[PDB]
């Protein structure tokens, strides 16, 4: 299948009580393998997955150096952005950055991302061609012009198209057992009676990886929606995910409805009927 590597940076400014908090997390597919906390005693890039721990001490020293340098960047960004919007010093503001790379099943480059956020809104983002910028408002336009002249997009474009893809491939091979695996969901169905006249049917999918899955409700072979409830996919806490779908059915009509599951772990889309 298609794999991706993404880095998420969050920097929040605390006016008064110290410096800004900086959190960095790295994901390959839906697995987190690295983290950095500005308030952590280690003050180093720590491993969160077993397959990354087998890296040499040279790797960690380099990764620790760059994440700390990026942390200093966003603290300056917070001050610069506060000037841009004429905002008061007393307020606490958040800056977030996300960049990532996509590879296809063939393991070659597919897509790239570079996006910036201030106070929960899009600020400046790199287009999919990796050569143009989108500016949200006037304040974003000031940063766009500087970045266009300095050829920042070209330096970034080199990283996603080349540097990430090489390291993403390296990460996949090093943890082939952990992240190149596919776990089929463990499906079952439950019955809940709201009242004498209508009952609730629950479709469960559990212990599956990757997180992406599709759950559909069909009545008599007809797609059933708007009468159904769907929850956000949840992490089980052991590297597997969970999701469930529910539909309200009148009594005696339970056998009409069917649950259809589509996941990469399943060679055939599963069908669940209450009987």
């Amino acid at each position: 299948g298609s794999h991706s590597m993404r880095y998420f940076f969050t920097s929040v400014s605390r006016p008064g009580r110290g410096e800004p908090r900086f959190i960095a997390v790295g994901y390959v597919d839906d697995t987190q393998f690295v983290r950095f906390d500005s308030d952590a005693a280690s003050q180093r890039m720590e491993p969160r997955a077993p397959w990354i721990e087998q890296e040499g001490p040279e790797y960690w020293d380099g990764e620790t150096r760059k994440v700390k340098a990026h942390s200093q960047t966003h603290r300056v960004d917070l001050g610069t952005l506060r000037g841009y919007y004429n905002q008061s010093e007393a307020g606490s503001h958040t800056v977030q950055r996300m960049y990532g790379c996509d590879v296809g099943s063939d393991w070659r480059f597919l897509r790239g991302y570079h996006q910036y956020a201030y106070d929960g809104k899009d600020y400046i983002a790199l287009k999919e061609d990796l050569r143009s910028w989108t500016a949200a408002d006037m304040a974003a336009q000031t940063t766009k012009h500087k970045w266009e002249a300095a050829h920042v997009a070209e330096q970034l474009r080199a990283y996603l198209e080349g540097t990430c893809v090489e390291w993403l491939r390296r990460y996949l091979e090093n943890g082939k057992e952990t992240l190149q695996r596919t776990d089929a969901p463990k499906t079952h169905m439950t019955h809940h009676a709201v009242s004498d006249h209508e009952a609730t049917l629950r479709c469960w999918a559990l212990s599956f990886y990757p997180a992406e899955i599709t759950l559909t409700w069909q009545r008599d072979g007809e797609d059933q929606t708007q009468d159904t409830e769907l929850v956000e996919t949840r992490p089980a806490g052991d590297g597997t995910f969970q999701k469930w779908a529910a539909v309200v059915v009148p009594s005696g009509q339970e056998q009409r409805y069917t649950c259809h599951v589509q996941h990469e772990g399943l060679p055939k889309p599963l069908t669940l009927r209450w009987e």
Partner: peptide, 9 residues
């Protein structure tokens, strides 16, 4: 691998 290039807004 973290981004090797540094930028400022």
């Amino acid at each position: 691998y973290v981004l090797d290039h540094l930028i400022v807004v």
